[PDB]
Amino acid sequence: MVYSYTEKKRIRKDFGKRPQVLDVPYLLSIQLDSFQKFIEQDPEGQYGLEAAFRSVFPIQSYSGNSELQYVSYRLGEPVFDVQECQIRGVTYSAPLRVKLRLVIYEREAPEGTVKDIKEQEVYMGEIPLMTDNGTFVINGTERVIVSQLHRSPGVFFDSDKGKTHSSGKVLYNARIIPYRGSWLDFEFDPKDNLFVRIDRRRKLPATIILRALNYTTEQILDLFFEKVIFEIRDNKLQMELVPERLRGETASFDIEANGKVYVEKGRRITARHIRQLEKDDVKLIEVPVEYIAGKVVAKDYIDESTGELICAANMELSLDLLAKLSQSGHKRIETLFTNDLDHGPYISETLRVDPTNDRLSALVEIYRMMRPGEPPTREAAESLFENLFFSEDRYDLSAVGRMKFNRSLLREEIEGSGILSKDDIIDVMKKLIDIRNGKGEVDDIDHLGNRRIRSVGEMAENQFRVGLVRVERAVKERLSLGDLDTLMPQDMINAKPISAAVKEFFGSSQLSQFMDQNNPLSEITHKRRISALGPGGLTRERAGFEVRDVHPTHYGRVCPIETPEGPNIGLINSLSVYAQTNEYGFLETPYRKVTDGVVTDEIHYLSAIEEGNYVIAQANSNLDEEGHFVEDLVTCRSKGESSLFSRDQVDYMDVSTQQVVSVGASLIPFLEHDDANRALMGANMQRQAVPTLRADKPLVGTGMERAVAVDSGVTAVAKRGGVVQYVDASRIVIKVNEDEMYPGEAGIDIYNLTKYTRSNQNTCINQMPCVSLGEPVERGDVLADGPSTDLGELALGQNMRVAFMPWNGYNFEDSILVSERVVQEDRFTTIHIQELACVSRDTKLGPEEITADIPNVGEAALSKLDESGIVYIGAEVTGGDILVGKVTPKGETQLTPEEKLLRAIFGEKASDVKDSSLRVPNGVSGTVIDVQVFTRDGVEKDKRALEIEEMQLKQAKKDLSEELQILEAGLFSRIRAVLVAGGVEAEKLDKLPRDRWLELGLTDEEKQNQLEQLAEQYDELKHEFEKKLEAKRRKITQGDDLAPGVLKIVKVYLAVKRRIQPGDKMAGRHGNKGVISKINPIEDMPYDENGTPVDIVLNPLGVPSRMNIGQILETHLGMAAKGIGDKINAMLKQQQEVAKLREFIQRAYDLGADVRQKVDLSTFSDEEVMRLAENLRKGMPIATPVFDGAKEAEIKELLKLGDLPTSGQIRLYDGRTGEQFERPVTVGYMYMLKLNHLVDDKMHARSTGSYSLVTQQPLGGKAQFGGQRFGEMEVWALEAYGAAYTLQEMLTVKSDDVNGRTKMYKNIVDGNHQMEPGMPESFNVLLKEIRSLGINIELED
Amino acid sequence: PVYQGETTQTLQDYLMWQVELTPFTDTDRAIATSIVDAVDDTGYLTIQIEDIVDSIGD
Amino acid sequence: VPLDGGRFATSDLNDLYRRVINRNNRLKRLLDLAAPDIIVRNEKRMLQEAVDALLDNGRRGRAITGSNKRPLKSLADMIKGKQGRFRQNLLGKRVDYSGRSVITVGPYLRLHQCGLPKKMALELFKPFIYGKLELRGLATTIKAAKKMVEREEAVVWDILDEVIREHPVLLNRAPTLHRLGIQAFEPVLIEGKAIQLHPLVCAAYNADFDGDQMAVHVPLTLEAQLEARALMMSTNNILSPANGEPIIVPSQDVVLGLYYMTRDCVNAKGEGMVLTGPKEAERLYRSGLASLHARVKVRITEYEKDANGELVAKTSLKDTTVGRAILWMIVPKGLPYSIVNQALGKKAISKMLNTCYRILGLKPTVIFADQIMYTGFAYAARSGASVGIDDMVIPEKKHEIISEAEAEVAEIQEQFQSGLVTAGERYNKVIDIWAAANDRVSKAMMDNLQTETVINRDGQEEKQVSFNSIYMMADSGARGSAAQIRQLAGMRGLMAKPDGSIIETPITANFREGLNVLQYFISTHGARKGLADTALKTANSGYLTRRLVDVA
Amino acid sequence: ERDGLFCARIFGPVKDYECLCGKYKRLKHRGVICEKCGVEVTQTKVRRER
């Protein structure tokens, strides 16, 4: 039945034509699921922090009899919590301490240890801990490190079709990229020449790398080429014949198979003769002599008597050699096949181009080629070649490369070494040659099986390993020099490089960026994005075009909808709602198991490759009562191409209809009724939904809005939900029941709300409570509602009554007409808490003290300041006024009489300081919420900090008091329960506890003992609380750690408030965007017989050109919901009976097909029905799935239910003339979302400001006063007009010329309106820059 | 790079700025700069008035 | 590069300088001590390399910085490339009088006006207001005028209105391919923070009213104002400089209004009667006649220019409708009556304005254009066109056509499995069959979305043109086309998205019903390809324009 | 610093009409070279033209 009593207030009418089997996951366990293994203690050193130590920590000195052993590590407790780290401005990290061991061995004795120093733990830097949901705290901010998509390490075979020489050929190449080390490639030439290009170097020669591995010429010839048979005795030339290999088009002559000739000379080839020759036993048959000239020798042969160098390897045989190989005695000279069809001579064709033939002369050529400046000395030629990609310390693949290597070569074993071997390259080249010949298929680049996502879990590990391998060198160099000496373990292990690397990775990187706090959806979308940019993958952003495209394997692993429309389109992707990371790093997707025609409730997570082997059905297929199919031929996918199959060949089936949809694109109603472009742009604009004052519920509904809101990590939940006792605007206490609590605790939980706290985009983060007083709350229920939330669900915008009609050309193309009743009703009003801050910057001449009595300033302007010089919180600071007075101590002079006289005249002003306070930026206004102040510990100041100090302390004082308060009662209660029938009265003990009157003859036995026992406990508690808060005080007044010069800062938080205006840009979920055009009064708006004028007017010209029937359906559903809500409101206002209301609600809920059941009067106690009806009296919310929403018939039925025209259109009147429109116009309440780009945040103009020192040009960006670049596209427009004079006045006079702009200003102020060209400064700068070289240039006459 | 060293005013250029706007003749403008350039930034002028007459060269 | 104060962090331009300086100093100091030949040779080689890298660090230099591996800025890279001195000395420098405000719409303006916010003013025409206050005596000095402007009193707004009375201004948009991207306008003060814009000139700037940032430049000198008034003024360039055709032609809303106000019916309210001609407007605001009343006789005065361009009047009592009769008053005298007695689509008013500019002149053409825009906005507001779920209807024979097509595909695949048809032949035959089915569905859609509105009469059936909003906004030419409407009722088609490969089974759904997940997923590839192509073609077009302009 | 980059005695002075020395710090002396430090007191604008 129904549950979640908190959600049971406003029940959403979901349709759900398809049932649900798999519950929606946490939807935000990717960053935290991968970062957890980085700190969790693993039983074996496989992954995480153990894999960073067990890998390269046990380093050994250079024969110094020293060893470094690792026992275990531990992470200390953080100094501050998540709250204080963002307030103060310090990072949130935990200290790392590890116990090491220094094993020293005595010389001249094997395995002889004298002592060990494994009794001290060393601290190696602080690792940045992770917050409750995926986020991190760095320098008071909140950053996110997006996971990066990388091709899995392994062997890849590219094609490069029609891009070699424009001749129509292809060069099948091969590449092998490891996880850490150097690369290796095998390129192919149109002239059948192989390359050994390494690390994108020059084109290397033929396969000499195999010759450098002790493999001689004959070994490679026997390996890559096979010798079938050869025999010659007394000029017989008899050889065995194989039908599969020795074939071709025709035969020259002399073809007899044991007597009777099967294939005559000069006859066509027949398969029947080949079959008859293969069936019958055929021995070695005679062959002509002309075939000897064509075939090439395989191995090296020499004469028996003479041992000269005749008959070398890789040399075609000739007739002149025949005699000289006939008398030598070589009867068996093995040869090659040399078949252009299958077994090509490509290997032999490249061996003849090798400059060297011996391994020694071969291994020295690659050394001078990889390194430009290096002489062959027989010293590094072997070591560098062995340490390049054959050493463990310089080459590794983390077993992922090994798995992909074993999988691409049809190997069964999955375990191997990180380094490469000879047989590995042998098999790689063999498969490459086979693919070139036509054995095998070309691998796919953009296939997801080859791609994998890397989160912080396997990136912070790499960063820590890189930071530790640097200190490893210092440890090695220190253990060698001065080893025989007793020292501390922390002798040379300084965690400077490790800390620097961790800081460079987390703080400022290419993947670590500020999160989008515009809305709860923005952050949950940004945490689930996937990018291909960063330190790896492709080369740059201008990489290719076929990579940034959708693939058939992108069905249920990424989102093809959510993607930007900028220069990085396609590269950015979004994870699906059911996507999940694999153990190796791949992407998996769930599917139900379908056996013997029935569907089993069990699910399996298939990967990208495994999905290609089975047959996967669709979620939109009908299902019988017994799990059977209605239609025999169901649409299913087999190998990418979907088609109809029988009910017996189906293997798997999808889970839901939103499996191909992400977390943000699933919040679009009627997605299938929208174009792929409009839905895309609507989901993109949905990320930037700016919140408002009161979030309005999405009456239309799209699905798991409650789930998205509760998983976005923006609201507060109630863990161990019991009973609520005290509610407040910033504090909520909850008394947990006896069942859901453990002993040793008071049994209360406290939640401190977050009220008006800044975000990464100056968006206020406010929270609101939900329970009033003494309401039972279950576990996991939402207690507090944050920004853009309403009763636990997500609400990005507001419901608004729209009407698609032209209105005096104000909605001409895409402008949205807005009534005046929308500004009056405080709708779409946003708060903006921007906050600047003035430093101290203590000099060396004096300490500029922030005072409250500066010079050159009236008393009226200093009437807003404090006694210590700091703007009172609550003041309505506007324009440009003093915010934080601060005078810099200027170096005072000496005697100079005038000063002496002047000084006496006034005092403490003349020759004292140089006024320079904060001053609110020219263009900022609004009340100042609160001011924070950080001071360097040890400085005798704390003027206004004391006030703040008390406040903070006070809050904590009561915070831990309540818990203790309750404890006290129990103690007395126990004493009062122990004093029962012990000669004690009621009022006597009530008047004053006093430890039960010091056990005044309660029982004269255990009574006193109990009392004593209780006394101790009571006293213990007192001391406990004392020290409990004792530490708290210390931390609060522990001081702040700033920089060097800075003395004491004081950040002030301003707080504006904007209503809407004709320059604001709003949009919807469907993609229909636009700016306002006019704010017309209420009366001008259209209306009808009843009234209620529309608030928003839209343009219907977009619907035909842009397929957005989804918004029409949304409008109709909103109209029906509002009609039902108005009927309910009327029934509540007429004070009707509860039975009629309950019947009406049940009838409005139970309408539709057998898709969902919901009935009242079975769980509600006649009191929750009125509560439910009060929450939706302004309209009840609906819910329609992504690809399983309501149908037109159901919408028309819901419209007819609400006592209104079934069509949806209605005859509207005119609010200006007063007549009626002949054509009916569609009305309803749709959902609108406010955007971030406004007009009061970008509009700026100027005429004269400050210009740069270079070429004397103004600024371009939004500085105090900046201009706009006048590009070439603008002057090209002017040259075709005749604006030569305008161009002349815009190029020099008002841009570059220094005296020119001043003279122009003078002439305009005087009223002359003339121009003097002169000469710009940019040309002079150019001449000065050209004269800096050996080039002469000067102006002549 | 960063050769955008924004410039400023402060009673030397600002003082000179006003000079142009007002109607001062060639002989007067010339003289104006002499006295507007002897104005110490701290507060008042440096040299005496008679100095200024001698540094006109008349 | 003045930093916080701790380290200056110079612009890495004097670093090469100090390197060369100290290298030459140590070389000259070593030369005086008679060093060995090898040492002095290596030192002079290092000096040569340092001097060669100082001029340019892009030839065997590979210079790095102290912070990261960034190339050191030489004296040759700051004079070339995209960012450099030759792109800061040419038209690449920022200019004052910026603008930068969101563009909105305005139906009360004319062809040579623009809504300028009062807040954007008082900062642009600042030296002008200063001079005005100085001449009016209300400003004794310059500091006084500056103080009065800073306080923003009542008098400075009147002074600004007086100054900006007849001072031309010019507008510019960031993407400006053709010369029409920069025009001039007469600024008009409007309360607000957004810049209004004429609906007809919008097509000139190629905007869609999703307002981006704009630019507003102010001519200071007299000759610049003269050039902006005589050459850059919008009332001077009406035709396109590429083909000599008018571009100020009305847009969707005006087209829709003019098409709705010009439409004949069968049995209207009070048809048949004879009208004077200027009386049709009276019965429009009352109930004695409909705008769509056909078979109505009303005389009109047609002026011709036969005798040496002299206006000769002629009356013939032509039969027309109430709407066309009312529109005729807007039509000037120098035009015949056979230009408005029609359907009046998009091309109709275009060629009407073309003929008007050809015959009657520029000023009367501009007058006719603004009046046409006014009356089109008015009739489009009075009409009340809306799009609903009932405004589109799926053909009833569509399911039968789909069943026949799938039966034909089944027969084709059966013949293929029998061994008579190969793979490629069967594939092409299935493609052709699906194309024929799509064509037949598209043809049957027009049977219901066109001339399918029967009205009761003496014959009970007349089969006049339909009055569906989807069809009236399409056929007129306002917005959309028949191919886009086809996807609304019929089938989308084959949609060969992946690498152009056609799929055997095409999408048989429409944007009104509920599409399948797989069909939407397949269709998504085409949009991803299209968006990428549109994002990529812009750079190529810009490079082509740059090269062509630089060459010619 | 003396005889270096941005130094005195070349590239114009660091101020309007005064050398780094500290004499002739006014318009009274315009085209004379100070004996203490040989820095011209011509103008500050001349620094970008030397």
Author numbering:
A (entry chain C): 1 to 1341
B (entry chain M): 110 to 167
C (entry chain D): 253 to 804
D (entry chain D): 52 to 101
Question: What did the study's authors say about this model?
Answer:
σ54 controls a diverse range of stress response genes, forms a major variant sigma class of its own, and has wide importance for various bacteria. In this study, using both fully duplexed DNA and −12/−11 mismatch DNA, we formed transcription complexes, using the AAA+ domain of phage shock protein F (PspF1–275), an exemplar bEBP shown to be active in vitro without its cognate DNA binding domain, ATP hydrolysis transition state analog ADP.AlFx, the RNAP, σ54, and a native fully duplexed nifH promoter DNA between −35 and +28.
Structural models were obtained on the basis of RPc1 and RPc2 reconstructions, while the reconstructions from RPi were insufficient to build detailed models. The flipped-out base of T−12 of the T-strand is stabilized by interactions with S335 of σ54 RIII-ELH. In the RPc structure, we could observe density for σ54 RI-H1 (residues 15 to 28) with P17 N-capping the RI-H1, causing a sharp turn away from RNAP and into the DNA double helix. M15 was observed near the −11 melted base.
